[PDB]
């Protein structure tokens, strides 16, 4: 008791980190089935975004982690403004984090070898704060997410 | 004639010429520019559908025009259920008709498919097309850039 939400956040953060490491092809120290499924489905979405929303992605420049955080929150706030949650939407949170991370690697001014760790943090926070309860109510990562996409 | 008649006939011509292109059979003599961009954009969508949805399509055995018509109707109903229309969606109508024509050929199909494709486009998007600059202006400007 006193650790349920802590465990949930750390699990979300682990998924977010491993997805972003997959995007940049960074070897993880620790993959589970949830990670494999998430990596497939989210990466599909990331490529779809980079291909089809190029003209909007070209409209901004991700010159800092601070800018990345603001853009992430703005876009995510708009996506989720209707108050609806489903697994597809959760997938897009990870996928757009990846889109922004790729932009940041190309566009960031300061050297930042740790960029993906900082992005994983604000991706995890968004998931927890906006979908954390829904995740718990909808089967979690194993009985909910994996079953949805397998 | 009526605006309805001219719109439907133009849609049908577009459907026919696209499906001829899908069948890779030559036609004798005036490809309009809307035909040319539709050929390009719809065929690329068709190839993407045939790749991405291979597992669904391989489940269908389109042994008659009736089966093709029903598949088309049901899929199109879902696609357009949200009441949104745009040019990308209009392109996918043509593309999915071509997907189904190809399947029919393997499993006059051309005449019947061009007809039910035209009817759906006219009935569900004809006024939108009119309001959004039509084929030889709005459509080509949309896909050129």
């Amino acid at each position: 008791l006193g650790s349920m939400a802590e465990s949930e956040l750390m699990h979300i953060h682990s998924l977010a980190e491993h997805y972003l490491q997959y995007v940049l092809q960074v070897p993880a120290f620790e993959p589970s089935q949830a990670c494999r499924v998430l990596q497939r489905v989210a990466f599909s979405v990331q490529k779809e975004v980079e291909k089809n929303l190029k003209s909007y992605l070209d409209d901004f420049h991700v010159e800092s982690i601070d800018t990345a955080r603001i853009i992430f929150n703005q876009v995510m706030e708009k996506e989720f403004e209707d108050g609806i949650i489903n697994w597809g939407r959760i997938v897009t949170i990870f996928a757009f984090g990846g889109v922004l991370l790729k932009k940041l690697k190309q566009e960031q001014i300061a050297l930042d070898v740790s960029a993906y760790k900082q992005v994983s943090s604000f991706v995890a926070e968004f998931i927890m704060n906006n979908t954390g309860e829904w995740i718990r109510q909808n089967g979690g990562w194993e009985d909910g997410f994996i079953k949805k996409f397998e | 004639g009526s605006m309805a008649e001219s719109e439907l006939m133009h849609i049908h011509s577009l459907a026919e010429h696209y499906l001829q292109y899908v069948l890779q059979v030559p036609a004798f003599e005036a490809p309009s520019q809307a035909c040319r961009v539709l050929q390009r954009v719809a065929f690329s969508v068709q190839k993407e559908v045939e790749k991405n949805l291979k597992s669904y399509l391989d489940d269908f055995h389109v042994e008659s025009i009736d089966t093709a018509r029903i598949i088309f109707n049901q899929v199109m109903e879902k696609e357009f259920e949200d009441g949104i229309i745009n040019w990308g969606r209009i392109v996918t109508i043509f593309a999915f008709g071509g997907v189904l024509l190809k399947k029919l050929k393997q499993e006059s199909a051309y005449k019947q498919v061009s007809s039910f494709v035209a009817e759906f486009i006219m009935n569900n998007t004809g006024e939108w097309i009119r309001q959004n600059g039509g084929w030889e202006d709005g459509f080509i400007k949309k896909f050129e850039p």
Partner: peptide, 23 residues
């Protein structure tokens, strides 16, 4: 008909992706 909902969803996704690719 599950296939109609599922294919229809994917075709809508393709359509709207195409719409966005061209602005």
């Amino acid at each position: 008909e599950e296939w109609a909902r599922e294919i229809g969803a994917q075709l809508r996704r393709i359509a709207d992706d195409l719409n966005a690719q061209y602005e």
